[PDB]
C-alpha cells in the first residue's frame, strides 16, 4: 500500500472517472497507460473493481494502452464504484513494469438518456425514464451522415472551434470546416457533438444539414450543457448512417456483452 488517488523504464496508469466524481449511467471505468502493454491479462489481473450494489462487469481494450470496464447494462443510479489499480512493480511484459498504484472512488447519478430519432428529427431527453426536454434537431446530411448507436457523453465546452482536419478532412475540402460553436457537448471521439447551431434553427426538426453533429437551438444546447454530465447517454436511431465504432472512445456500449465479456486479452 503505497497508493496515489486519481484526481479528475516504467508505465504510469491513469484512471477515469476521477476521485469523487458523479457520472452518468454509461460511464465506463477507464485505465490508460503511458506505454503499450504487452501483457494485457497481467494488467487486467492487477485491477480490482468493487461495486455496491455488486454488479458483474468485464474488461475490453480500446487500444494497446487503454483498458475499459463496464457492466452488461447501464449502471443503476446510486452505485458506488471503487477502483484499485495495484500495478506497482507488476510484470506488464517485454521489460515494462507498473510505476505505481492508483485508486479512485466514484458514484452514479441519475439515468439521463437522450434519444435522437432520425424519423422525427427530435432529440428527447429522459431523466429517470421521464421526458424532461424535447429538442428539434438537425443531423448529418445524407452525404456526411450521423452514425447510429449509443454514445457516452464526454467533455463539455462553453465555446470551441471544431476543425475537420483534426479528423483528417482538410478544411478547404468539400466536407471541410473550421467552425466556432457555443455550448458544445462531445459525444464521440470521432468528432460528434451536441451543440448550439443558430444557423440551422430553420432546419432543426425538418432536415439534416450537418457534418455529423446534432445541431440544436441555442437555448436547448445551453440546456443540454447545463444538465448533462460525463457518462450520460445519447442514443441515435434510424439515420442512413452506420454504427459508431465500439472502439471510438465513447462507443463502448456498441460492443455486445458477449463479445465484450469474452474480452480481448489474448
From Swiss-Prot:
Residues 112-237 form the L,D-TPase catalytic domain. One of its GO terms (biological process) is peptidoglycan-based cell wall biogenesis. Substrate binds at residues 177, 190-191, 215. GO terms for molecular function: acyltransferase activity; metal ion binding; peptidoglycan L,D-transpeptidase activity. GO terms for cellular component: extracellular region; peptidoglycan-based cell wall; plasma membrane. It is a lipid-anchor. It comes from the Bacteria. Disruption phenotype: Inactivation of this gene leads to altered colony morphology and growth, attenuation of persistence and increased susceptibility to amoxicillin-clavulanate both in vitro and in the mouse model during the chronic phase of infection. Loss of both ldtMt1 and ldtMt2 results in phenotypes that are unique and/or severe compared to the single mutants lacking only ldtMt1 or ldtMt2. This is L,D-transpeptidase 2. The lineage of its organism: Bacteria, Bacillati, Actinomycetota, Actinomycetes, Mycobacteriales. The chain holds residues 123 to 407 of 408 of the full protein.
